[PDB]
Each structure stands twice: as structure tokens, then as C-alpha cells.
RNA sequence: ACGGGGAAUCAGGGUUCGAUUCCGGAGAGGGAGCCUGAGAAACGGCUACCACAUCCAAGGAAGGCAGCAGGCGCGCAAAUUACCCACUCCCGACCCGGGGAGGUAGUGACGAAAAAUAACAAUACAGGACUCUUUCGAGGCCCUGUAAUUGGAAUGAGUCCACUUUAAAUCCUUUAACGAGGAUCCAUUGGAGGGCAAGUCUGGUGCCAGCAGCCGCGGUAAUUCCAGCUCCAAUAGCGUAUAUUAAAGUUGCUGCAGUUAAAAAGCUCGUAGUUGGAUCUCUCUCGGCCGAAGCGUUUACUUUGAAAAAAUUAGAGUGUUCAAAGCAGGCCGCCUGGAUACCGCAGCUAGGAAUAAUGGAAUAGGACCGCGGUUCUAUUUUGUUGGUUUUCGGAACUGAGGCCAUGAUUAAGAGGGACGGCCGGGGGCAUUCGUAUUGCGCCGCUAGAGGUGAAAUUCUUGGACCGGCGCAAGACGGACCAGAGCGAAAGCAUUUGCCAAGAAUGUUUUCAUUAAUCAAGAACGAAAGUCGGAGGUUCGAAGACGAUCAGAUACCGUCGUAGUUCCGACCAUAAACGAUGCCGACCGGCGAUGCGGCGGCGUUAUUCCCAUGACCCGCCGGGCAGCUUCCGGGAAACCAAAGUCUUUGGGUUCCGGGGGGAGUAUGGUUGCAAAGCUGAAACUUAAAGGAAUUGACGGAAGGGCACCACC
RNA sequence: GAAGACGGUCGAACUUGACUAUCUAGAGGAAGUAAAAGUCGUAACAAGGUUUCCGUAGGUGAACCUGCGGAAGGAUCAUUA
């Protein structure tokens, strides 16, 4: 179930047996790649380039076709941003939750929910730092958290 | 449920350690507490000085009238009521002598319709309860 | 969450041969299962089983045979010397006659009685009868 | 609490104990300081002080039994002021001396071993035993025994002799002389209702005396007391009191329990702890199977091999007369034994690598190759030693390039995040509306309305109640409204707008173990209550009255204060309940319902070309529920979980141990206070309690009946 | 090379200051515990005669009563377009 709410829910992608690239698509993994830079330089986070690339020119997966993953892709060029996309995410969400918060001193449920969030962030955070992706002393602090996003 | 760890060896220790606590007679014998409040002090036997001659009621729902004895300990100076066993027994006793006492058989516990009584005497003046109620010795002049 | 698959494999063998069923999925696979599962079946308890192949982590189908009364999982896999065996299958087996413990050794995975042939002791994964 | 070896049951696991003869330590009344000596902070050495205490001629002197004996004291609790260096050893200048070490002993039931108190008739008997011919009849063929008529044989308990024994000796052993017929050479201790073996036999007692571990017995016919007889349990041994172990699966690791019996924290985050998804099968030297040399990524295992005192325990042998024991024992001088096992954990050593782990290349800052370019050179040479002999068993500055099949497992019916259309009384802020209630102002009367089944208070030619127009206040949000939804719980319902959040669903998106549960900490937490500031309609603790009552100052009625409402700050408690922790698997069926998605005949709505909304029939996922249960489980009530449990182990937190005392006292801690959290014991008790079954009862319902009922 | 305070050391002791936990003395106050129909007087168990109980506040001549919120362990698993 799900790790803050008691919610067990059912709701994911099913990957396909065949790993190989569909029929349908002609274009090369270099192609696959160009437009991964194109759309990383348009300011999308990979979870975007995925959305589009499976969405409009249609690559099933970007692994099946490169051989890589998309953020490692960008990480080769040099495109990634300086801190992970889902760690920034519940950046940018403690941050909108606690500037609510400031006028609206009232919404206990806001306080709640803001420290589940903040829960999350330290998780995340440990785990980036136990994996070098972050800095040993990076630290999350509410005076600090609109900075980094 | 229990914790079943390969690594759970000291929570499972201190658990039983804390939960034993909870055992009553595990409380009353390694407590402390139960050792000075006991006037024999640990001990099986004790010697006392018969003060009076008392009659205790016996326990509603039969009636008669418990032939026992206040002593005072020598040990402690602590003040026993002891049960005089057997018929006539309470006539081989007279005030203001020694006598021996140990316990009722039930570890502090009163026995029977004897109400408040856990002693009994077991010797007096040296000789034992039941060797005068035999009539294998006499009192000593 | 979900540890120690083996548990639940023999858990849902277990539940399966209980309801009287012929056959029982059983997922996720592993070596550990697929290693239970043949020393089961040597043993004639079990019967064939096949393993579907799907890209991330098998799942198998065993077909059930009859005999099988109880399998379970020892937790945690205690270290059990060969000299702790005698003790482990008393609290464990119905009977001297028949029943297995399955160890899993340096030398494999294999039951108790192949354990102390080859002068082996190990951790203790389950049991079946 | 000296530690250990070790000791008390054997299911397995454990729980207790170890002052005590072996090892180690410490101390010599308590401290302290020293001399001598190889060795002492020595005490059967010294010097002080402290506490006791001896002699004294009062000037002084002398002390240390937790050595052997003995005293006193303390106690429930423990021996002789004996003999000896003969043994075992120790000491010395020593073959010779000494040793209360040690050995040996008239009243040691601590405890352990062996083992007497009897073994054999004619006889009548209640008997039976191989085909018994007869209920009136062979029964030392086989056995039992009421026995005031029997009989011989056996023997040691005892008393004594011989000195075997021993350092003079007692003791066991040995030989002799006496030594048994109520073989009086006389077995006891506890019981006889049950548990528990064995008398509702007799006498006495009469809820007395007493018995009774517990249940109970005794109140003039006691199976239980006091006794007689008889019976039975163990037996030279039995009873009792305590501590302790098993019984106790009532401490549960094996292996308990937590809906209602005692019990899951009000709820949710959270660090430590515990647990954690799949996935990997001229490297090296004497002679064309050998020691060396191993960073294989250290480990955890598992299996070996050394090292782990003896005694004890297990165990091999060995007729102590048997046994407990001991380490010893024959053959007309020789053979032997004085074993072996185990000795946890932690250290040391050695195969194969299943299985917590640890993952060596990801800005490449990753083997192998040609360059020695200033340097150490088989600790620079290799005819009578001579500077300079650049790379072939090493060390730094690293300037170039190449086979690297060059190097990123997968993408969990694990988790996080993104995205999409939704969805919900979820939350906060602001803003609308609705009647109702209570006041207020006007417009119309009998002189009534209120309140309770007639028991009252409560205004009045100052007009109540009622009817109608408005106005103002606070409170609340009916019906719709559901075993429906949302939220972590508490809780959440008038419209609209804003703000941030959220589950589920959809996803061939992204990250790639980031996870589960959680000491410590933290957020929220009904109502009531507290402190300030507003407000104060209604209701209303307290209070004031009025009421049938024996008695309310209770229930009822009329008023009514704090409160009830809002804004801050506290409080942290509820039957905060599903009296049921959370996460994850598996295990039946069916019809619905809420949300999302997918599919499909048809029916309805926006110009006649389509989606889409409302229906209809289905499928999938999550959710609130409705279910037999002989899947299954429970004591059952009941529960598809309270199932997958003696066929007992998925992970983890909290927590109970008969009922009271008691959630009390005390300490701590929080609070302004009220109080909250943590939280005993002495003592007391044989039950308290849970589920259900029958009856009885109900100022409980349904249906009937009766002049011992009524009408 | 034989007695005795003194740059000193180890250091028992000894009075004086706080006034230290295992220990005891009095009329007390509050409470608990054992069977006792103890001088008009019933809270609970039945709808216990005001349904019971929880938390929290007051008040009481005692069980107790009342207000607010909650529970069914209720005396309703149900009440109709």
C-alpha cells in the first residue's frame, strides 16, 4: 500500500514481454536521442521526454530502442538537473503547502499533510546521499527549500 | 506477534526480563519486599515468648472457637499470633514461655476457617507439641 | 511487505493441497523455491511443475499430487549443525519413518537425510510431510 | 553477590543454586604505615590510631582462634578442650628433628549403599486344581490361612575368647563358648469422604471440643473430631515447616494470550532497533604432478584439525562377598589396567560456496604494451682492486596510441515521483441564503394562555395567548440524508469564489530498493474544563421556586448562573469501540453499492452529419458493507477472518499473567488550575469472571383463560 | 654511627558544619480490609420501575443527581411514496 496514505492501490504500467523495438517505429536511436537533448533543452524532466516521446512519435520504450534510460542519457551528454526530478518535485510541494500555510495558520490539515511531505523529502533525501547522488551535507530546511526550487 | 529475528535475541531477553515482573510469585520472591515484611525473615522456624492465651473466631461459615497464641519473636521482637494445634494443647501451654513456630503450610497464606493465622506451634518449653499431646513426655518441672 | 518468498510459496502449496487442488500458481519464483520444490519432488510429494517465464521474476505452476499433508518454512533459517539434527527433526516430523527437513548447505540444497550423508549441516529452510 | 570447575529434573528447551574440601581472589577486630627478606604492605611479624579487652604494687606491661579443640553470644540451625606423625606430603644445616597440615577416634537418622524382625506340619476347616461315578463322599497333587493340642532344623542381634586390624588401639573380617517359640530378641510414622490406597463398623461428643494443604466434616442415627477394633501407604524409616525444580504451554525460544474471560497505545508521522523482492555456472622456483609465494572482496556459516586442569558427569574393563564405591584383581616370579567421549561462547587452522551480508568500471580519476630522459645497479668491478658498463626477478615525474564482444541485470500484482480525466458532508479563508426561535414596534378581544392524563409556580382595562405587517440579534443548517461518501483519528452537510492537499483509476512515463514496523522524539486529538477579548438567541451544570411522594434539595414543571457561540492561549482525556495494531501472501459462492477505467444490443436530451450526459447488460481495479461456514477456527456467542495453530516459525510494534487493595500511596514529570503520564507495596481472598442451557422472576411484549378475577 | 618539631610524603584519627537510606516513639487526620437482615430511609441486576455505562464538570442528607459529548456491553440488526 501506499507508503503515507492507507490507500493500496492496483494502478501501474504492464510492460510488454517483447523487448525489442516495435515494427512501427523507423527512427534509429540516435533520432531517439536528439530528441531527448531537444526536449531536456525545452526544460522537461524525464518523466516529460518519456510522456511525449511515448505519446506523439511513439517509442513504447526508450531503453528498448537506445539501450539506455532517459536520464542516464542525459546524465552522458551533460543535461540532468543538479538535484533528482522526484526529490525536486516534493521540493516544490512542501514549498507550495508551507507558503499556504503562512496565511492560513488555521488549516491543521495542511500542518499535517506538510510534515508527511517533509517525511517523504528526508526518506528520499537519505537514500540520495547513501547513493552519492547528493552531497553528504545537503539538508532540507524551510528557509532553504525555495532556493533550490 | 513476536519478533522473530535472527538479531531479536535481545528484545526477546529484556521482554521476559520486564514481563516477569508481572508474575506474582516471581514479583513476591525477587522483589524484596515480601522478605521484611515476613517475621520469621526467611526463615522455617522461629522461637518466641507466648504473651497471652487468644481464642479466634473461626470463619463464617462453620463455627468454633481457634485456640491460638500471641508470641513475640526473640529474632526480631515482632508480635505472632500461632495456632495451637491439636485438643487440650492449649493446657500444656502457659503464659510467658518459650515456644517454637513455624508456618501453616501455606507460605504465608492463612489456612483453612482460621482467620489472619499463617503460624502454629510446633514446640513448647522445649518439648515438642505432640510428645505432651501423646503423653511420650511431660512438662518440665 | 513481502519477505521471504519461500514462505509464501509453500504457504499457498500448503493452503492449495488443503482445498484439494490440482494445480497452484505460485509467484514469485526463485532459485531457493525451485530448489524446495525439486527436492519435494525427488520425493515423489509434489509431482511436475513448469516455470513461466515472465521478463521480471517467474512465476510457477506446480501440479499437486495427493500426498502431500503439510510444507512450511522455518523463520528465521537458523544455522543447524549436524549434531542439532536429531533434535530439529523430532520437533518437526511426524514420524521417524517418514517426513523431510530441507536443508540448505554448501553443498546444495537437499533434505536431512542426504545432509547427513554427506556430512553436512547447514541453515534450516523448512520442511514437508 | 567472592568468580569458576560444578549441583539439584532428564521429553526437547530451560529454571534455580554454587559460603563449602579443586583452581583463582581477598581478609585476619577496623583502617593506615612499615622492617626483614628472593618473595609480605605478613598480622600464630612490627609501629600507630579507632573499638573492645588482660595483669598491675597504678610507675607500667601485654593483646588479636575467619588455625585445631573448646567456651559465651547469636540464633530454626551445626561435633571431642581425644590419640599420632604409622600413611600423604611439607619444612629444616637434615636418611635421624618437627608438622591440630594431615591421618586415627564410646551417644553425628545431613545424606548415600547393602540389609534382619523369621523358613518348613497331622489336624477341622471357605476353598478350588487333569474323565471328581453323588448337594449327604480320596482334597502333605498344587496352594491359603481363624488356631487357648504341635514339632524339630537354621541363624544372627547380643555377651565373651583368641589380639587379625592399627603408630598401643576400637570397627569390619575370622575362629571358638553361650545366645529364639507370645522365637516378649514384641517396627514405626502417617492415614481410612474425595483428590489418594484404605470401614456411611462400635462407643463418646453434639457447629462444642476439634478435624480439615483444598473441597468440606461437627448444630444427640459424624464414612472426617476424641477413642476401640479392623483396614493401607512407605518402611528403619515416616510426618511437618520453609527455599527451590518439575508439574507451569500459569513467563510460552521451542511454546501462551490480547472481540466478549486480564489485555491493541485515540490517531498518524517518525530516529535507533528488528526485518527486507527477482537476478551471477615466462601469474609461480632443482624432473614436462611438488613446499614455498596468495588481497581470492574482510565476513557470517558448515565441516575438520590443534588447544582446552583434575575431580564431578557420561562411559570402557575390573565379582567391593553384591552395591554405593575404589582403581584396581587368581593361576602349581610372569601378564596386564589405571581408557575414551563431552568440555559451552570467544580466540587459532583447513575443502566446497546453498543461504542476512559486503556489489571491485559510470565526469573512467579502470589490465597489457616500445620508451630509465638527472637517480639506487645480483647492497656499481669480474687480468694484479681504478671515475663512465641506458631498458630483461622493483621504486616517482605519467608526453603519444591500440585488441578492450570496452564497462549501466531486470523493471516487483514493492515503493517514491511525473502526467491525464475525474471524484469526495476532506481542510482553511472569504462570501451568499433559509426558515425557525427570542426580543422590539405598530394593527384587532373573551379577560385567558403556559404547563403537566385536572398535583402548581408563571402577565394583566399597564391587552397576555392568537392573527398580520416589518425590524434586530445570535444559534443552527430540517426534509433530500442512505448499514452512502471523504478524512490518520477526532470529525465532516446552505450557495458561490479563492488557496493548498488527497485516494482510487488510467499509464508500453520516470527513479530503481529508495521498503515494513517502529525505543527516543513530534503533529493532530469529541465533549467537558481553565485564562484573556467579543458575543450572549436557544438550551442550561449551580441555584430559586412549584409539584403526586413517608421522605428531594431526584425524576416532572417555570425560571435561571457559569457554560453552550466566535477569536487567541491552555488542557490531552472518552464505551477516543470494529471493546478486533500495521505491512504482505493464500483460502468459497452471490447479489448489490461508491469511484475510476474498458466493452456492448437497445431507450432518452441540444438544429438532420458524432462524441457526451441520464438509463440498460457486462468486465477490471481500489473502497464502505450485506454471507453460510461441515473451507476453516473458536469455550461458545460468533468470525471469510477472530481462517491458513501440538501438521505449532512471513515481518514488526504495543501489551496481559486469579480477584481485591488500586490506577491507590509515594517519587518524578507536565499543567494557571482542574488534573494528565509513569506507578507500588503491606494486607486480603477461593474464587472473581466469560459464553451458553434450563427454570424462576420482570412495574417487558404477543396471544389466550377464570365470578376461589374483574366488569 | 645511638633521642626530638622543620622546602616534605603516605596517612589512620580527632573535634566543629551541613544535619545522611535501610531504624524506632504520641492524642492525631484520610483510607483499605473479615461473616454479622443492626430503630421511619434503596444506587445496580427486569424497561430495576428516571435504560445502563464512559469522559468531564458542578451539587448531595447517602447510595447518587444533573449538564455536555459519546457507546450499546439496549429495551431497536427492520418501519415502507
Redesign the interface.
Known amino acids: 500500500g501506499r507508503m503515507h496514505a492507507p490507500g493500496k492501490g492496483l494502478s501501474q504500467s504492464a510492460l510488454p514481454y517483447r523487448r525489442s523495438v516495435p515494427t512501427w517505429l523507423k527512427l534509429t536511436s540516435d533520432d531517439v536521442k536528439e530528441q531527448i537533448y531537444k526536449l531536456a533543452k525545452k526544460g522537461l524532466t524525464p518523466s516529460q521526454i518519456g510522456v511525449i516521446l511515448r505519446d506523439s512519435h511513439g517509442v513504447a520504450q526508450v531503453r528498448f530502442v537506445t539501450g539506455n534510460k532517459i536520464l542516464r542519457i542525459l546524465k552522458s551528454k551533460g543535461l540532468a538537473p543538479d538535484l533528482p526530478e522526484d526529490l525536486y518535485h516534493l521540493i516544490k510541494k512542501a514549498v507550495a503547502v508551507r507558503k499556504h500555510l503562512e496565511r492560513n495558520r488555521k488549516d491543521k490539515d495542511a500542518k499535517f499533510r506538510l510534515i508527511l511531505i517533509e517525511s517523504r523529502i528526508h526518506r528520499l533525501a537519505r537514500y540520495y546521499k547513501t547513493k552519492r547522488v547528493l552531497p553528504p551535507n545537503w539538508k532540507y530546511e524551510s528557509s532553504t527549500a525555495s532556493a533550490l526550487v | 506477534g513476536k519478533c ?3 538479531r531479536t535475541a535481545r528484545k526477546l531477553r529484556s521482554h521476559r526480563r520486564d514481563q516477569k515482573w508481572h508474575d506474582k510469585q516471581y514479583k513476591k520472591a525477587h522483589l524484596g519486599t515480601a522478605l521484611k515484611a515476613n517475621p520469621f525473615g526467611g526463615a522455617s522456624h522461629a522461637k518466641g515468648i507466648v504473651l497471652e492465651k487468644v481464642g479466634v473466631e473461626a470463619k463464617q461459615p462453620n463455627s468454633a472457637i481457634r485456640k491460638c497464641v500471641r508470641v513475640q519473636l526473640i529474632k526480631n521482637g515482632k508480635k505472632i499470633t500461632a495456632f495451637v494445634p491439636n485438643d487440650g494443647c492449649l493446657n500444656f501451654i502457659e503464659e510467658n514461655d518459650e515456644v517454637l513456630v513455624a508456618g501453616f503450610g501455606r507460605k504465608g497464606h492463612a489456612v483453612g476457617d482460621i482467620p489472619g493465622v499463617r503460624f502454629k506451634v510446633v514446640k513448647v518449653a522445649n518439648v515438642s507439641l505432640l510428645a505432651l499431646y501423646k503423653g511420650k513426655k511431660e512438662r518440665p518441672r | 511487505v513481502r519477505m521471504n518468498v519461500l514462505a509464501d510459496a509453500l504457504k499457498s502449496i500448503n493452503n492449495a493441497e488443503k482445498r484439494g487442488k490440482r494445480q497452484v500458481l505460485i509467484r514469485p519464483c526463485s532459485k531457493v523455491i525451485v530448489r524446495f520444490l525439486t527436492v519435494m519432488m525427488k520425493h515423489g510429494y509434489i509431482g511436475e511443475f513448469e516455470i513461466i517465464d515472465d521478463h521480471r521474476a517467474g512465476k510457477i505452476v506446480v501440479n499437486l499430487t495427493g500426498r502431500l499433508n503439510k510444507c512450511g518454512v522455518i ?4 544455522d543447524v549443525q549436524l549434531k542439532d539434527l536429531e533434535k530439529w527433526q523430532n520437533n518437526l516430523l511426524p514420524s521417524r519413518q517418514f517426513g523431510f527437513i530441507v536443508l540448505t548447505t554448501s553443498a546444495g540444497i537437499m533434505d536431512h537425510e542426504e545432509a547427513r550423508r554427506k556430512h553436512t549441516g547447514g541453515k534450516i529452510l523448512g520442511f514437508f510431510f
Open positions: 522473530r529475528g535472527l | 523463520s528465521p533459517r537458523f
